Every structure is written in C-alpha cells, then in structure tokens.
C-alpha cells in the first residue's frame, strides 16, 4: 500500500471529504468505517452524526500534510468517491474515528481490507470504554 499526498478541499460528513489528489479535485470516502451521518435522505442527522463529523473536520483541518492510502480491492464506489485510508499528518483518520468510538467498522468492500483488524481491535477498545455511540 502506497501513501500518497493530497490537499485538504472540504471536509462534507464524518465519513466523506473533498480532497486534491494528483491534481484534480475529488470526493473520498474513508475506508471500513460506518459513521452517523448528518446526510441521509431519512435519518439524516443521526446520533453522534455531528460529533463525528466535527472530529472529522477538525481532524483533517489541523494538519499540516494530508496523505490519501488507496487499498488492494476496488478503488472508487457507484457513486465515483474514491475508497480510501486518509492519513492526517501521520495519524489515520479512519483509526481515530474508530477508537474514539465515533464509527463503528463496516463490512469489508470488494478485497479492501489491510487495515480491517488494526481498525477492529481499536473499536473493542472504543466498546470496553464505552465511548460515544458504545456508552
């Protein structure tokens, strides 16, 4: 797995961000996560949604270098998100949301899943401490 740079466009919802990547402007979607959205045709603003969406933010707002990490299965979604570890100065978003208790870890999409146990030992961590969506 290859960790490559990108600049921060906008943050859009705990689990999706507008970033530049290789020069073009494009919409990513953090890998292995599933996050309370505050976007949902029903739902919508869902427990915990803008905490995570908050942390997302700010996350990804703070640092000074931002590095997209593409995995070994299908790299973009139907909609045309590319699937991918986000990286914020050296610290993986995905991890941090995960162990935060701010998302829980999602089905394994299409072969990617390097990181999925790394991600899985941080939320029975996030469970055993029972943090925000585990409290």
């Given amino acids: 797995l290859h960790k490559?740079?990108?600049t921060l466009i906008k943050a859009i919802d705990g689990d999706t961000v507008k970033l530049?990547?290789?020069?073009?402007?494009?919409?990513?979607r953090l890998l292995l996560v599933?996050?309370?959205?505050?976007?949902?045709?029903?739902?919508?603003?869902?427990?915990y949604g803008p905490e995570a969406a908050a942390f997302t933010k700010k996350m990804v707002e703070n640092a000074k270098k931002?590095?997209?990490?593409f995995d070994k299965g299908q790299r973009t979604?139907?909609?045309?998100?590319?699937l991918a570890?986000?990286?914020?100065?050296?610290?993986?978003?995905?991890?941090?949301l995960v162990r935060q208790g701010?998302?829980?870890?999602?089905?394994?999409?299409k072969g990617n899943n390097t990181h999925?146990?790394?991600?899985?030992?941080?939320?029975?961590?996030?469970?055993?401490?029972?943090?925000?969506?585990?409290?």
């Avoid at 976007?39 to 919508?44: I, S």
């Avoid at 570890?85 to 941090?96: P, Q, S």
């Avoid at 961590?125 to 585990?134: H, R, V």
């Fill in 85 to 96: 570890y986000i990286y914020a100065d050296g610290k993986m978003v995905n991890e941090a």
């Fill in 116 to 135: 999925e146990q790394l991600l899985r030992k941080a939320e029975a961590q996030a469970k055993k401490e029972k943090l925000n969506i585990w409290s």
């Fill in 66 to 69: 931002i590095e997209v990490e």
């Fill in 4 to 6: 490559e740079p990108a």
């Fill in 77 to 82: 979604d139907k909609y045309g998100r590319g």
């Fill in 20 to 28: 530049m990547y290789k020069g073009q402007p494009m919409t990513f």
């Fill in 34 to 47: 599933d996050i309370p959205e505050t976007k949902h045709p029903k739902k919508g603003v869902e427990k």
């Fill in 102 to 109: 701010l998302a829980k870890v999602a089905y394994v999409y």
